[PDB]
């Protein structure tokens, strides 16, 4: 047994058919010592008497909210959640495997710049008796996370997307990251406890926003165009320090440049698309920005 | 009086070679106090450049050690060879066991990629405004 938060405990249950579980000792959080009784959830049945209660936790039926009483008053509550493992594997029912980048991707994080601000997101099929708790640090309590919030609801499979915005308190955008950020998500469905962790460097989760203000300037030759764009508004400043690189594609042909302009040959009915990437570090390319011929 | 555009061009090439060498305890890093941000470079660009120089010397000695020259032998056309040469070039521009020790090479190459990216940003900003 271990404390998750005040009056909330986790019991690691190694489940297989024939028992035998964990022998758990609960202690009443009170200066009192006498006339203490114990109940479980929504039953009046006295499970035990005394400041302490010994429980054999073998299944979800032994989990729940234990309460201690004295003189017709509740003294404290102890909520027992289970972290179930079967065949040495912890349960991962609450979060859906995003199956991209690889398999066993439950959390996904992304940064639009080097500010120290980032977002993590996950998917669930659960709509009730659900709670998420997000914690983060570098290595060192530098990171503050907001509350996990429902950000989307996709239909047929009926999945709910949750997202959280985190921020590194003492970030140095111009320095070299030596220790990675850790993102920890606690997931509780009814009496079932689950965990999810992500370890990354901000530089690795960078995905800039698309190039903006994509314009075409027709040239002297028919079908020859001068394409221009600008850096996204959310990207790190100054742009002369935090440089981007671009990819220009005629869709319906390809050109890589560090400049915000290019000359290509347009077929009418075709589209010119532009995407951006950090010039110095191989992180993700942005979504395509597009303009018709 | 640093050679800003020469340094910019070479540092960018190091990003390409470092990546090419792998795509994707114990080293130096560019820290907060090193003054590698635009303001630090405006006030006194030497603080950041000495620190970039120190890191370049460290990585070149590591890339020339038996961690890289040992076993399994790198390919004769490896970008590590050019990376080693270009590290030397940039530091001179600023101031003219068995196995399966791959795990250590990759720990070094990954760390080097982060170092050369900060350096490239410094030279690109300096070449553009200083």
């Amino acid at each position, epitope marked *: 047994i271990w404390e998750l938060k005040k009056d909330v405990y986790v019991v690691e249950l190694d489940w297989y058919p024939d028992a035998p579980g964990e022998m758990v000792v609960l202690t009443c959080d009170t200066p009192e010592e006498d006339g203490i009784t114990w109940t479980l959830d929504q039953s009046s049945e006295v499970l035990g008497s005394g400041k302490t209660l010994t429980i054999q936790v073998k299944e979800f039926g032994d989990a729940g909210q234990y309460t201690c009483h004295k003189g017709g008053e509740v003294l404290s509550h102890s909520l027992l959640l289970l972290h179930k493992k079967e065949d040495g594997i912890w349960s991962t029912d609450i979060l859906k495997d995003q199956k991209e980048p*690889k398999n066993k991707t439950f959390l996904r994080c992304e940064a639009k710049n080097y500010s120290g601000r980032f977002t993590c997101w996950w998917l669930t099929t659960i709509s009730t008796d659900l709670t998420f708790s997000v914690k983060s640090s570098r290595g060192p309590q530098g990171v503050t996370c907001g509350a996990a919030t429902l950000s989307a609801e996709r239909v047929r499979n009926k999945e709910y997307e949750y997202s959280v915005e985190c921020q590194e308190d003492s970030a140095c955008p111009a320095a070299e990251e030596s220790l990675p950020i850790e993102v920890m998500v606690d997931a509780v469905h009814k009496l079932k406890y689950e965990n999810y962790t992500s370890s990354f460097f901000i530089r690795d989760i960078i995905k800039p926003d698309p190039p903006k203000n994509l314009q075409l300037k027709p040239l002297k030759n028919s079908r020859q165009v001068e394409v221009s764009w600008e850096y996204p508004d959310t990207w790190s400043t100054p742009h002369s320090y935090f440089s981007l690189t671009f*990819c220009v594609q005629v869709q319906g042909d390809r050109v*890589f440049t560090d400049k915000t302009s290019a000359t290509v040959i347009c077929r009418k009915n075709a589209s010119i698309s532009v995407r951006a990437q950090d010039r110095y570090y191989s992180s993700s*390319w942005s979504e395509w920005a597009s303009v018709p011929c | 009086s640093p050679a800003w555009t020469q340094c910019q061009q070479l540092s960018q090439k190091l990003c*390409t*070679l470092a990546w*090419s*060498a*792998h*795509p994707l305890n114990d080293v130096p890093h560019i820290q907060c106090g090193d003054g590698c941000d635009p303001q630090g470079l405006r006030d006194n660009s030497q603080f950041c450049l000495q620190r970039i120089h120190q890191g370049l010397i460290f990585y070149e000695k590591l890339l020339g050690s038996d961690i890289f020259t040992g076993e*399994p032998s*790198l*390919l*004769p*056309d*490896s*970008p590590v060879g050019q990376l080693h040469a270009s590290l030397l070039g940039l530091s001179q521009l600023l101031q003219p066991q068995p196995w*399966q020790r*791959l*795990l250590l090479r*990759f720990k070094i190459l990954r760390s080097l990629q982060a170092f050369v990216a900060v350096a490239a940003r410094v030279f690109a900003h300096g070449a553009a405004t200083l």
Partner: nanobody
Amino acid sequence: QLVESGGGLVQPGGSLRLSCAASGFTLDYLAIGWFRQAPGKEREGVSCVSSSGQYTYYADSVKGRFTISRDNAESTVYLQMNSLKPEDTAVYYCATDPECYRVRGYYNGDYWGQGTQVTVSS
């Protein structure tokens, strides 16, 4: 993101040409490997090309039949498979193998993606 293509069902002593597309990047200066996974059994190194195409490595079971090559700005690595045999039936995966470590005989430290099924009907 390299993409595997070129697989298919073929007769023994037949031919196939597999290809790995990169996007979204150039294959300039990258060592690339071809690997294979037959039903139930472990992943095997097949062939590998050095960054400049001068150094090639082949598993003893494929020499004289398979030929690995790189393409000029097509950002594709090819695997010419001649004189095919039921023994060569597997899902073929292509991956970055820097210094050709893995086809060569050393261990790394993995995958991605989805392969292309090669079947040689006995």
